[PDB]
C-alpha cells in the first residue's frame, strides 16, 4: 500500500515488511495489486515494477513438444476427434457463427473409455493443430504439503492464463484427486478439501474468456 505521495509500503521476499520512499519514475497507478516490483539490496527503494510473473512450472513447452499428430493420424476416435474440432477450432475462428445463431463460448470437456483407447492421443493432435498457447499441467502433483499450495498452482495457471490470452490452455486429469466423496475425515483432508473447493470455486461455473477446454479423462 501507499501512505502518501511517492512513498509506500512493500513486503519482500526477505520475510519482513517495509515502508519505502518510491521515485516519480513509475506512473502513480501501476501499483494496484501486489505486483512484481524491484527494490534495492542495501537501502530498499523502488526502481521499477513488472506487471506479469509466475510461469506454470514448465510453461506450455513453448516450441515443438506437440507430439506431431494429425487428425487422420489418429486411428479411429471420430466422435471425440470430430466434436473436439467442433468445440475447439471452429469456435476459435468463428466467434460470429456463435453470434448469428447466438449460442455460447466454450469450456472444459469430459472423456472416458478403457485404458488403451489412445486417451492422450487426442490431446496430442489437438495440441499439434492449434496455434494457441497450450499451457499443460498434469494432475497428481496437485497433492502437496503447504496450505493452499495446489490451489495457488491453479490460481497461478489462471492469472497467467488471463494474462496471456483466451487462447487454449490445457489440463488432463479427473481421477481420484477430485472424487465426489466430500464427506470423510480420512487423511489429507486439508488437501482433499482445498482441492475439491478449488476445483469447484475456480470452475465458478464459468470464467467465459480463458482456458479453452480443460479436457478431463
Partner 1 sequence: REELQLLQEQGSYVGEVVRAMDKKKVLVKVHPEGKFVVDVDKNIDINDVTPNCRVALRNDSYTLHKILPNKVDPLVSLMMVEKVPDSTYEMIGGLDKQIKEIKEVIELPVKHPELFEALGIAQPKGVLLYGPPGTGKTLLARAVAHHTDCTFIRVSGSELVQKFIGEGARMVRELFVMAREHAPSIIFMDESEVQRTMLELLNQLDGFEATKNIKVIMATNRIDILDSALLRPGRIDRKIEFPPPNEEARLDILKIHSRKMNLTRGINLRKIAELMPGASGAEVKGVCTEAGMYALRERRVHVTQEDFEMAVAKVMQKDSEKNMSIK
Ligand X SMILES: Nc1ncnc2c1ncn2[C@@H]1O[C@H](COP(=O)(O)OP(=O)(O)OP(O)(O)=S)[C@@H](O)[C@H]1O
By a kind-dependent CB cut-off of 5 to 8 A, residue 45 interacts, out of partner 1, ligand X, none, with partner 1
108 is in an annotated binding site: no
Nearest partner of 217 among 188, 185, 162, 178, judged by Cα:
178
Sort residue 9 into left (φ over 0), alpha (ψ -120 to 50) or beta.
Answer: beta
Grid cell of 67 as nine digits: 507430439
Nearest partner of 62 among 135, 158, 164, judged by Cα:
135
Instruction: Tell me whether residue 61 or residue 103 sits nearer to partner 1 (CB atom).
Output: 103
7 is in an annotated binding site: no
By a kind-dependent CB cut-off of 5 to 8 A, residue 47 interacts, out of ligand X, partner 1, none, with none
19, 39 Cβ separation under 8 angstroms: no
DSSP string, 26-48: S-TTTTSSS-EE---TTT-----
Q: Which stretch binds partner 1 (CB under 8 A): 38-46, 54-62, 118-126, 135-143?
A: 38-46
Q: How far apart are CA 132 and CA 91, in angstroms?
A: 13
Q: How far apart are CA 82 and CA 34, in angstroms?
A: 43
Instruction: Tell me whether residue 9 or residue 38 sits nearer to partner 1 (CB atom).
Output: 9
The residue to which cell 537501502 is assigned? 43
Q: How far apart are CA 185 and CA 194, in angstroms?
A: 13
By a kind-dependent CB cut-off of 5 to 8 A, residue 205 interacts, out of ligand X, partner 1, none, with partner 1
The verdict on 204 binding partner 1 (CB under 8 A) reads: yes
Instruction: Tell me whether residue 3 or residue 116 sits nearer to partner 1 (CB atom).
Output: 3
Q: Write out the residues near ligand X by the rule CB under 6 A.
A: 75-76, 115-116, 118-121
Q: Residue 8: in which H helix or E strand, if any?
A: strand 7-11
Contact letters for partner 1, residues 41-60 (x by CB under 8 A): -xxxx---------------
The verdict on 152 binding partner 1 (CB under 8 A) reads: yes
The residue to which cell 512513498 is assigned? 7
By a kind-dependent CB cut-off of 5 to 8 A, residue 186 interacts, out of partner 1, ligand X, none, with none
State phi, psi for 36 to the nearest 5 degrees: -75, 105
Instruction: Tell me whether residue 43 or residue 186 sits nearer to partner 1 (CB atom).
Output: 43
Residues tagged in the binding site annotation for ATP: 113-120
Binding site for partner 1 (CB under 8 A): 1, 3, 9, 15-21, 23, 32-34, 39-40, 42-45, 86-87, 90, 97-98, 100-104, 147-148, 151-152, 155, 180, 182-183, 190, 193-194, 197, 200-202, 204-205
Residues tagged in the binding site annotation: 113-120
Amino acid at each position: 500500500e501507499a501512505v502518501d505521495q511517492n512513498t509506500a509500503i512493500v513486503g519482500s521476499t526477505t520475510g519482513s515488511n517495509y515502508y519505502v520512499r518510491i521515485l516519480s519514475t513509475i506512473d502513480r497507478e501501476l501499483l494496484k495489486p501486489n505486483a512484481s516490483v524491484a527494490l534495492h539490496k542495501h537501502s530498499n527503494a523502488l526502481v521499477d515494477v513488472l506487471p506479469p510473473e509466475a510461469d506454470s512450472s514448465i510453461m506450455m513447452l513453448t516450441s515443438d513438444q506437440k507430439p506431431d499428430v494429425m487428425y487422420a493420424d489418429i486411428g479411429g476416435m471420430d466422435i471425440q476427434k470430430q466434436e473436439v474440432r467442433e468445440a475447439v477450432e471452429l469456435p476459435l475462428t468463428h466467434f460470429e457463427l456463435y453470434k448469428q445463431i447466438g449460442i455460447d463460448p466454450p469450456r472444459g470437456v469430459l472423456m472416458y473409455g478403457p485404458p488403451g483407447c489412445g486417451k492422450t492421443m487426442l490431446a496430442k493432435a489437438v495440441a499439434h493443430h492449434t496455434t494457441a498457447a497450450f499451457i499443460r499441467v498434469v494432475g497428481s502433483e496437485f497433492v502437496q504439503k503447504y496450505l493452499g499450495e495446489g490451489p495457488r498452482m491453479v490460481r497461478d495457471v489462471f492469472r497467467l492464463a488471463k494474462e496471456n490470452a483466451p487462447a487454449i490452455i490445457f489440463i488432463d486429469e479427473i481421477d481420484a484427486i477430485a472424487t465426489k466423496r466430500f464427506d470423510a475425515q480420512t487423511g489429507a483432508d486439508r488437501e482433499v478439501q482445498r482441492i475439491l473447493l478449488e476445483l469447484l470455486n475456480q470452475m465458478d461455473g464459468f470464467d467465459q474468456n480463458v482456458n479453452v477446454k480443460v479436457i478431463m479423462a
